[PDB]
Amino acid sequence: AWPKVQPEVNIGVVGHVDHGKTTLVQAITGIWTSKHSEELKRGMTIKLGYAETNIGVCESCKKPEAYVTEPSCKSCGSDDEPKFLRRISFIDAPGAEVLMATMLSGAALMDGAILVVAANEPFPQPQTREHFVALGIIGVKNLIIVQNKVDVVSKEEALSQYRQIKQFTKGTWAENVPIIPVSALHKINIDSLIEGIEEYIKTPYRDLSQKPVMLVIRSFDVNKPGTQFNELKGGVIGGSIIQGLFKVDQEIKVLPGLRVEKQGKVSYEPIFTKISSIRFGDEEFKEAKPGGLVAIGTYLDPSLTKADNLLGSIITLADAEVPVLWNIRIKYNLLERVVGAKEMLKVDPIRAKETLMLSVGSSTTLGIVTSVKKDEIEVELRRPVAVWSNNIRTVISRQIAGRWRMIGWGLVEI
Ligand SMILES: Nc1nc2c(ncn2[C@@H]2O[C@H](COP(=O)(O)OP(=O)(O)OP(=O)(O)O)[C@@H](O)[C@H]2O)c(=O)[nH]1
Ligand SMILES: Nc1nc2c(ncn2[C@@H]2O[C@H](COP(=O)(O)OP(=O)(O)O)[C@@H](O)[C@H]2O)c(=O)[nH]1
Ligand SMILES: [Mg+2]
Ligand SMILES: [Mg+2]
């Protein structure tokens, strides 16, 4: 048998709309990540998708067919049980250009990524470029490029595009990243991709002694109709543990917290609660570490957590000291051009009184620029952000031609 453990690594899946991201996650894990009504109606990813799988290797078989996602080697001709390697998970991002902020919030959770490029579309499409640039800015360097949809192009065309892709990465941080051709729809060459994931997206070193921090991307009321009172639950909060670990019965807090009134002004009250349960996928655990997206059960009234109310928050231990800032100072750099547009425009300098969008951890916040210097801006935010460490990365977006567009990045200075 294989052990039941939490996933130990998060692999982003990014790329242009309809290039095959969600189908690729299904080919690997068996799971369709889209769970929302609007996603099914429109045939598109809107919220961050998620799926897990075990990975193992059949020691008697040849590679890449030796790599498997279930405890059997019958496919490669062996009756032996495969050796368990690790459990992995996928953060399936939307490719729609209007959903870039959602992609950026998912990128904060990624240990590595697969950039999916459709073989039957011109390269590089706007969000192929834009997601590539985002990965570079955020530092998600452990990249595999997957050339998808090879089932509907000639070998000549696939090879031509392959050369284009290598030339695109030439002279960049990604010069040496592998390109793996597959068909996500017909599950062709998926074994090679799993081998690639093992070689190129290793589980990173973690630090379990650091103060526990979870970035929140989901929150739920898990109570369903037709159930007895004796199995009703308090609010559940979902996200990624980025450092340290959490345990059942631990006293925790959600930051910035709840928007309330205090002294005729808007304030955020930290939400204190206790961990009642920990789940990854369909499995319960007593503790949670980095890797995978965890569901933290609490004793909170489920009205506080319903419908992703706490998206963008962080969770820490109750006694942790974490800055919660309404005004932030950012040491910044600007991109040369707006990469996500069908036409690349030059990026104008930041000016005082501009309203910008700031991506910090899993949070997305608008704010007004109160001060501009050569490499430093100060921003008055519409809602405060939890800044759990010095020199946290922020991505800066500006509204250009009716769309939020990534224009730069920086470090939040505390
Ligand atoms: N022929 C062929 N079609 C594919 C392949 N992979 C995906 N598709 C099709 O491409 C369309 C888009 O697939 P999705 O998986 O929804 O693509 P996506 O990148 O997740 O789209 P968004 O999340 O909205 O950005 C669907 O019709 C798929 O069936 C493939 O390998 N070959
Ligand atoms: N920690 C914890 N997580 C839960 C509990 N019940 C549900 N979840 C998680 O909360 C998320 C929402 O689940 P739900 O609304 O029931 O949809 P479902 O996963 O399809 O059953 C899922 O990822 C569950 O794994 C619980 O009692 N404790
Ligand atoms: Mg679609
Ligand atoms: Mg999708």
Nearest ligand by distance to the CA of 116? 1
- In terms of Cα–Cα distance, which of 325, 347, 326, 323 is closest to 409? 347
241 lies in the same domain as 291? yes
- DSSP percent split of the chain into helix, strand, coil, nearest 5: 20, 40, 45
7 lies in the same domain as 138? yes
**Residue nearest atom 9 of ligand 2, based on CA coordinates:** 295
Method: X-ray
* Domain boundary residue, one of 206, 233, 250: 206
241 lies in the same domain as 201? no
24 lies in the same domain as 158? yes
119 lies in the same domain as 200? yes
Count of structural domains within the chain: 3
Distance CA 405, CA 408 (A): 9
* Domain boundary residue, one of 188, 206, 224: 206
Q: The domain spanning residue 146 has which CATH number?
A: 3.40.50.300
53 lies in the same domain as 174? yes
Its domain, for residue 362, covers 322-414
282 lies in the same domain as 410? no
Q: The domain spanning residue 248 has which CATH number?
A: 2.40.30.10
94 lies in the same domain as 198? yes
User: In 3-state terms, what secondary structure has residue 268?
Assistant: strand
Give distance in angstroms: CA of 20 to centre of ligand 1. 3
199 lies in the same domain as 214? no
85 lies in the same domain as 217? no
14 lies in the same domain as 155? yes
Residue 45 Cβ < 6 Å to ligand 1: yes
- In terms of Cα–Cα distance, which of 301, 167, 177, 329 is closest to 233? 301
Say which DSSP state 106 is in. Answer: H
291 lies in the same domain as 366? no
What own/partner pairs with CB < 8 Å and gap ≥ 24 does 140-143 have? 140/12, 140/107, 140/110, 140/111, 140/112, 140/113, 141/173, 141/174, 142/111, 142/112, 142/113, 142/200, 142/201, 142/202, 143/112, 143/113, 143/114, 143/115, 143/174, 143/177, 143/200
Interacting residues of 275 by C-beta distance below 8 A, sequence separation 6+: 246, 247, 248, 249, 250, 252, 296, 297, 298
Residue 277 Cβ < 6 Å to ligand 2: yes
Give distance in angstroms: CA of 236 to centre of ligand 4. 25
From 46, 152, 185, mutation site for ligand 1 pocket: most ligand atoms within 8 A of C-beta? 185
